[PDB]
Ligand binder design. Sequence first.
Ligand SMILES: CCCCCCCCCCCCCCCCCC(=O)OC[C@H](COP(=O)([O-])OCC(O)COP(=O)([O-])OC[C@@H](COC(=O)CCCCCCCCCCCCCCCCC)OC(=O)CCCCCCCCCCCCCCCCC)OC(=O)CCCCCCCCCCCCCCCCC
Ligand SMILES: CCCCCCCCCCCCCCCCCC(=O)OC[C@H](COP(=O)([O-])OCC[N+](C)(C)C)OC(=O)CCCCCCCCCCCCCCCCC
Ligand SMILES: CCCCCCCCCCCCCCCCC[C@@H](O)O[C@H](CO[C@H](O)CCCCCCCCCCCCCCC)COP(=O)(O)OCC[N+](C)(C)C
Ligand SMILES: CCCCCCCC/C=C/CCCCCCCC(=O)OC[C@H](COP(=O)(O)OCCN)OC(=O)CCCCCCC/C=C/CCCCCCCC
Lengths: 603, 459, 56, 174, 99
Amino acid sequence: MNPFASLTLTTLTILTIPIMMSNSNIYKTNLYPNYVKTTVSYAFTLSLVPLLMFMHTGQEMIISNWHWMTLQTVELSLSFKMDYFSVMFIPVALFVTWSIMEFSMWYMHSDPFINRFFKYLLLFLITMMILVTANNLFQLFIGWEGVGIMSFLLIGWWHGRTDANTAALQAILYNRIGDIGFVLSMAWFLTHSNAWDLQQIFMLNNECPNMPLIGLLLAAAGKSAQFGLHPWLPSAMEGPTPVSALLHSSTMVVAGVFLLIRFYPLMETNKLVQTMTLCLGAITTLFTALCAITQNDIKKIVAFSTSSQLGLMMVTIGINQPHLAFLHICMHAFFKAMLFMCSGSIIHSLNDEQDIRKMGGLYKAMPFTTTALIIGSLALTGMPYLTGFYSKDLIIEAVNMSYTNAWALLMTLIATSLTAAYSTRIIFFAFLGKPRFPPLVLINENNPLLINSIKRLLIGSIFAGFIISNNIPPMTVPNTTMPLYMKMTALIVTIMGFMLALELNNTTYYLKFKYPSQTYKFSNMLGYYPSIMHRLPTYHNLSMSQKSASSLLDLIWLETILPKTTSFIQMKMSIMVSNQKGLIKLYFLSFLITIMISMTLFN
Amino acid sequence: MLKIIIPTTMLLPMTWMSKHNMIWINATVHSLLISLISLSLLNQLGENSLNFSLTFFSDSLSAPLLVLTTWLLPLMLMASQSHLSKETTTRKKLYITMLILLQLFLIMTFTATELILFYILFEATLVPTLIIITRWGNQTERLNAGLYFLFYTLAGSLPLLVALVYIQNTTGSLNFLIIHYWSHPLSNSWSNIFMWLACIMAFMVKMPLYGLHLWLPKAHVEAPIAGSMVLAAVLLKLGGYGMMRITTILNPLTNYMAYPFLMLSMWGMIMTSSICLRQTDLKSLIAYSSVSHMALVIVAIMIQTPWSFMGATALMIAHGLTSSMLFCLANTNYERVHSRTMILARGLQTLLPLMATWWLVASLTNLALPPSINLIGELFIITASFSWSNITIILMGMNMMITALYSLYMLITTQRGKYTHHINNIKPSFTRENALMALHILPLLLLTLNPKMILGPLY
Amino acid sequence: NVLQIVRDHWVHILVPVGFVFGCYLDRRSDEKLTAFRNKSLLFKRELRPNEEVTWK
Amino acid sequence: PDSWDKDVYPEPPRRTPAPAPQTSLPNPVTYLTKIFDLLVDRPVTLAREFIEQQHAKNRYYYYHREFRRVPDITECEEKDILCMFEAEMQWRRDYKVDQEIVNIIQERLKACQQREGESYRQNCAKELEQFTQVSKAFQDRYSDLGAHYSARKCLAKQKQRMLAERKAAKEAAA
Amino acid sequence: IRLQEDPDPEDENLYEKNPDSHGYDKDPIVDLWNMRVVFFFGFSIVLVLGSTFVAYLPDYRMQEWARREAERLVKYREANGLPLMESNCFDPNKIQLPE
Ligand SMILES: CCCCCCCCCCCCCCCCCC(=O)OC[C@H](COP(=O)([O-])OCC(O)COP(=O)([O-])OC[C@@H](COC(=O)CCCCCCCCCCCCCCCCC)OC(=O)CCCCCCCCCCCCCCCCC)OC(=O)CCCCCCCCCCCCCCCCC
Ligand SMILES: CCCCCCCCCCCCCCCCCC(=O)OC[C@H](COP(=O)([O-])OCC[N+](C)(C)C)OC(=O)CCCCCCCCCCCCCCCCC
Ligand SMILES: CCCCCCCCCCCCCCCCC[C@@H](O)O[C@H](CO[C@H](O)CCCCCCCCCCCCCCC)COP(=O)(O)OCC[N+](C)(C)C
Ligand SMILES: CCCCCCCC/C=C/CCCCCCCC(=O)OC[C@H](COP(=O)(O)OCCN)OC(=O)CCCCCCC/C=C/CCCCCCCC
């Protein structure tokens, strides 16, 4: 037998194993975090093996091991699609999760429920693996909702925090609108294709229609926090830093992009949905970068950077370049996870301080996190030969060289410049200058766990792009011929954003105070979208829930029509019948009238 | 079916002859034994039903409901023994007798092979329920709740009796097999319209349909814990079972008379979810959630496709289990603080951890979280409604969003936050309560493992 | 003693004997419906040399 | 394998290319496959050999039930309950068999798509046509019978279809 | 006041007299045996035995039989050129349409 299926299913099963040990003395002791981390590392190597198998001969398989149920002519079975996407995403996700779990062993030392935290992280990893390897729509939806509910559980990790509860419920709401779209797509696919699996969907849908493709697009936008459904991702920073580093930025928010990638044949068949995806990605990346360039919370800045990168990936899908989107998924996972880990290290060193206005002097205060963050920012902005170069540069070239929307192309370029701008802002306000933190210096980054996790995610941020780019087979025709200025477009806009942001940030040293502008207020306050869209619609819906449905209809009029009017009529008639004075003269005269009526009327 | 009916009629003398301190033990043990015996009905055929005799028969639709009833009886016994410690021995025996009679009537209802016998038994289920509500309810509103429940159900059901006797006179038999093999099309006329109205309106009132539901909040809020458990788990499913059984002879008139009921069910599902969003009472919240789920079942039955019936059956079973569990959790919190206000007791996540876990699992099953049978049934109904029309997806999506919103709102309000400072009588959760929650939740996950057992004859 | 224990634990046989009686009554009800035994077109067959009925 | 019929479940003959290395570097995939064979394949093979040896000692058989044909609803007289019941049961069994036939064809289609991979659009035209024919016939037979479907309703639908076909043919010949 | 009514008694705690109480009854022995019978019968007997019984229920729905019959019919029809799915459920020769 080919070791492919055995090794892949073994990686999944050994990921599941430590959950079965969650009712044991090992779960009761303090060895559970290290136990889970070791299991994740072993799974990572055991999943690297099938990646080596694929890199040689390009082997791909489907494993429908267990048959769940047959609904007349529709068979649902537990099937895993071990293809290029799965065998490339699994090792990357496992590597990132391993690094995050070690960083969490360092970072969450004082948490009373660190064992439960590690169990939740492992459960999220299991659900994400189910989502990635799912071969049919029902199993994909299982993974979808699993990662959604794990996000809900981990965002509101501190149950006593009202803001945490609000953020968790907000994420659930937006992902549930996405699930509305997903269920629309699933229902259409079943009705018009008699199956819920990719093989038959691809066979029967030779020209996929707008209704299923728009359903998929809505689900992807909801899960990946595109414009319209974006605010939940930045608000998801209420959870602990390991949750933000692993779940949201790196692995979970790419679920919608991955879903769109998995239906790239249908996306190729359609054109209107491709245009809508391109425009949505462009507006998302521009808006989120513009909001990012003026935030004062480092976690917020990194979250908006993640949203902008998701918008760029959606742009990549919209120009019919699905494989570049997956490559960017991997590279972004690497360097964004490292950036979030560096931000968490800074926060922990400065005693839970998440304000760049209070950070400063960390370039020499903390050498290793400083160099790691600089490397991550250079990779994010597209340093000419780092991990982000082998995806972002190709994405920009494809955008320039394709039959794209002019406004979408312009917004993509401006978003790249603003990416450079907010990376400059992070570095400038976090490491350069004089200290602004409280005088009691508790800075200490000499922990081997933190150092080793950042080291593991740091070698990937430099070399992984080259290796992955040179090992994958050519999935698309390259853009060999192009003008020199159009080749340099990404670098030129990156340098321009760097210089402009650096000049504007250096202007802050002047002893000159000026009131904020309308554009600054719009950008800092997230475009006013959370304010209006979180106060007006919710107020109207909740007011209608009680004023109209509960009070006016349920408690007033539905009571007035059937039960109250009938009872009132019965009471009135009963009073009328029983209101007799007991006078024989009266009711004997009534008898006479009755006798005459019977004699005359009835014949 | 006598091997299941007679053991209950022997449970009655056991209850009335047991010692004063052994009534609960005996009733629980032998109810569990009867449930184990009744598990045998799940071995159904692929072609026809199980016809035991001229009076009782079992089907792939009747079997899961019977198993649910037999499994639900001991849970009601546990909750009742929780809240009836100070009652006299005679009144404890009377309460157990009422529960036993209700289970016996439900079993005979689900196994009755003739429409008139089914009517007699499903009407007989009112008397024990009314006695339980109006006698062992805590609040002053139990009397009004019982009146509302009784009169809604009877005003629905009397025209059903007239329709059944008229059908018997016209066709010669009310036996279900005869009326299925000898079914004839129902021509479009006022007489057939009113026969359809009589039957469907009786079962809609039993469902309940939106606009005919007030008795459900009234009864469920004001009934004792056992009464609330049986009202939502099984008694609500009598309407769905009847509609599945009675719609054999109502075609093709159902294709045209279903529009008002479908519109009512969809819009009232949305309205009751929105009501759940703004409820100040936990029992009322659970009752309106039940209303929304049964409205979805009504939609499935009315659209009347093989894919809708399977989803309807699965949703009925899943909703029964989930509603019983939610009512039990609310009753435990009520026994802690002697009040049903949802915001009175908070911080129960940090006051009672494992009970918070039970709350989380119950709320996760309440919303359609895959691969739970709740999600299986809801998804089948949504797909069938999508095939029916392509805006039903809009309505179902809105309902799902509001369902998740109010479920997690209940969970966060009851569990998360900071505990009430002045509430200091919240003792650690009892082994009995935890066992009750475990017995509520584990069969749900096992049915998730094996889903074809609750998908009905259409599977 | 046994006499005191049995006087309290004699009720536990009621449900088992009811189950046995119910199974017996099910058998009796089935034995009254043998009007088409070994006469259905789908399952009609010749009897084995050492059996009297196809099902009881 | 002999477990299933190769004609019922077709599979093209596999064509695995012979390895033609062009480097002096070792093959990590080859080494890991050798290690997998030495550590997993041999132990599981020994365990299965022992299990099969245990199975062969107590060999016993099970059979496939055979149903003889019975008169259908067309032959059944009006309100003849016994014949109607027999015909309804036979129709239900045939309905289940047809559902499984459609399932077999769908499984064949899915397997062929996955096997052909990047050129599935051209190489799977044969299996798409078979599925198209089977789905068309199955839909025509059991499309909109309803939740309370029966042999009488299917027969009425077939009668309606035949009347429409006869009217169309008569109009064409007119 | 308008009646001779008892005051509302204080709520009773089972843990006060019996610290290791399962919440079933006041008497410790009866409480323990109620817990034992509930746990044993319910969990062990009902859950485990009924679940394995349902898992190993015989295939009376004829799913496997239907699959085998479909396999045989597909083999026979494809081996002889006949259509895999017939176009008619019944025989037009046996159906007598009105004129
Ligand atoms: C309905 C409209 C719909 C529009 C849709 C399209 C929107 C596109 C927007 C694109 C981005 C615009 C610029 C950023 C806006 C936000 C500024 C902000 O909040 O700054 C504070 C924030 C720092 O705030 P803070 O440190 O917390 O302190 C508070 C401030 O002190 C507080 O001081 P402040 O309040 O005085 O600072 C703000 C002030 C000063 O800040 C700036 O000017 C920042 C931007 C400077 C660079 C952008 C202009 C030049 C770009 C191209 C230069 C090279 C061109 C090519 C040359 C060679 C050709 C061969 O900004 C302005 O006065 C507005 C400038 C931007 C206008 C955007 C378009 C019109 C908006 C609506 C009309 C109203 C505009 C007037 C304002 C409202 C009424 C009073 O600034 C930064 O972090 C740096 C921002 C700029 C860095 C990136 C620069 C490059 C990327 C953008 C340009 C595109 C380059 C690549 C083009 C490729 C083409 C193929
Ligand atoms: C080829 C053979 C294949 C296998 C065949 C197996 C056949 C088994 C035949 C014997 C069964 C009867 C004896 C064992 C009964 C269980 C006792 C037990 O495990 O106790 C340990 C457990 C644990 O014991 P414990 O916790 O009290 O004791 C621990 C030890 N000390 C004393 C130190 C504390 O017992 C309990 O928990 C008691 C709970 C109440 C038990 C009531 C039993 C009533 C009589 C049996 C009724 C069974 C009905 C089953 C349903 C109908 C049939 C399906
Ligand atoms: C503390 C840590 C918790 C997590 C770890 C727990 C320990 C590890 C457990 C891991 C389990 C993960 C799921 C894996 C399950 C493996 C077994 C499962 O796959 O078997 C199923 C078995 O399914 C069972 O049927 C499910 C039992 C369903 C029981 C229903 C309720 C039982 C009665 C309860 C009464 C309540 C009634 C409720 C209303 C009806 C599949 O069915 P099937 O493939 O075919 O069986 C094959 C045998 N055949 C071929 C002969 C058929
Ligand atoms: C298809 C169905 C319809 C889809 C749109 C319907 C929207 C209905 C709105 C839901 C009603 C809300 C019910 C109760 C929800 C919980 C109560 C609540 O308001 O939560 C408060 C919480 C707190 O706000 P914060 O910003 O975190 O401030 C915290 C300060 N301490 O706010 C929220 O979470 C509400 C968020 C959702 C509000 C509605 C926004 C959705 C509108 C966008 C729809 C358009 C989508 C466009 C699609 C584009 C992709 C193709």
